[PDB]
Amino acid sequence: MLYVEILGNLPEMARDEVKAMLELGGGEIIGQDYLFLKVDAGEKAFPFLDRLGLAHEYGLLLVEADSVEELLQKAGEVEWPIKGAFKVDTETMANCRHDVLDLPRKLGAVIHAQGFRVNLSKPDTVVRVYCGERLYAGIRLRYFDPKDFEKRKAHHRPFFRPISLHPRVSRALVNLTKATREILDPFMGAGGILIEAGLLGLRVYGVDIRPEMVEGAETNLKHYGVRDYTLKLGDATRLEDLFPDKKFEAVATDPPYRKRDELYRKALRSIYNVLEDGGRLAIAFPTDFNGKAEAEAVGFRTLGRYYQRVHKSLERYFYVFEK
């Protein structure tokens, strides 16, 4: 059993991102306690969970209990896979219903008795306790540091344009398509989505109608050590002609906000036509465009729609569509 802690700002999107990665990894979510997900999966899922953009961490889930007394009792009956020295670190969620004061000391004593030493300042293994409606104990396998994503915001890129999604959301869009080989962004701009895809080890394709963006995205992709790219100057409504004998595994994009609606309709048709059967499109549209109806009109099935206000006079949805 595993656990994943998700970010709370876009919690349905975050849960669906985990669902998508678990589907690749042969597992599924079996419970949720606030922003703690109980996960039925194994090591096969680790490389996919490693991809997450809207999660705080994941790890092994070793104990679930309905009281501290029960938590400590079960923790004694578990073989703890501790590497090196450990420490206990509790995460008190907003819905915590338990007194966990001094729990790190108590659980620490239980685990220490199994022949493991405690290092409070530099642990090799972090034992985690989550407190929500229930108590959960396990071992953290990966922490996703928010800092790593903040460091890839637009003003840190050699080609700076303040026109990208948050890197975490760019990453989540890529993952919601479940791409494992490649992805296309036909409105690529400064390359924010393709940067995340490339960092995930995917082959990337990009289009932009502006030469400066084609040049700039390449500058940024090189900056992040992405090598497996194909960038083209051209029109997202003509992907069939741009990539004549190609069906893409996945598409993720944030289009400009021709008349707007006509561009969107034509781009949806063009993208549909170059997607593999079973392929997915992750895409944002401002809320005043009927994205669901228009995409379904061209043949897409809608898998997800997630609302986000951008600023005081702009709202959008993130969509996940399936051909």
Ligand X SMILES: C[S@@+](CC[C@H](N)C(=O)[O-])C[C@H]1O[C@@H](n2cnc3c(N)ncnc32)[C@H](O)[C@@H]1O
Annotated binding residues for S-adenosyl-L-methionine, written as ranges, equal 193, 208, 235-236
Q: Is 59 in the site for ligand X (CB under 6 A)?
A: no
Nearer to ligand X, 27 or 192 (CB): 192
Instruction: Candidates 20, 207, 242, 320: give the one binding ligand X (CB under 6 A).
Output: 207
Q: How far is the CB of 316 from ligand X (least distance, A)?
A: 12
Number of residues counted as binding ligand X (CB under 6 A):
23
Nearer to ligand X, 199 or 209 (CB): 209
The residues in 144-163 that bind ligand X, with binding defined as CB under 6 A, are: 163
Q: SS3 for the chain, per residue? A: CEEEEECCCCHHHHHHHHHHHHHHHCCEEEEEECCEEEEECCHHHHHHHCCCCCEEEEEEEEEEECCHHHHHHHHHCCCCCCCCCEEEEEEECCCCCCCCCCHHHHHHHHHHCCCCCECCCCCCEEEEEEECCCEEEEEEEEECCHHHHHCCCHHHCCCCCCCCCCHHHHHHHHHHCCCCCEEEECCCCCCHHHHHHHHCCCEEEEEECCHHHHHHHHHHHHHCCCCCEEEEECCHHHHHHHCCCCCEEEEEECCCCCCHHHHHHHHHHHHHHHEEEEEEEEEEEECCCCHHHHHHHHCCEEEEEEEEEEECCEEEEEEEEEC
Instruction: Candidates 108, 189, 291, 304: give the one binding ligand X (CB under 6 A).
Output: 189
Q: Is 47 in the site for ligand X (CB under 6 A)?
A: no
Instruction: Candidates 210, 247, 301, 309: give the one binding ligand X (CB under 6 A).
Output: 210
Nearer to ligand X, 139 or 184 (CB): 184
Nearer to ligand X, 86 or 285 (CB): 285
Q: Lay out the site mask for ligand X across 215-254 (x = CB under 6 A, - = otherwise).
A: --------------------xxx---------------xx
Nearer to ligand X, 189 or 198 (CB): 189
Q: Is 209 in the site for ligand X (CB under 6 A)?
A: yes
Interacting residues toward ligand X by CB under 6 A: 163-165, 170, 185-189, 192-193, 207-210, 213, 235-237, 253-256
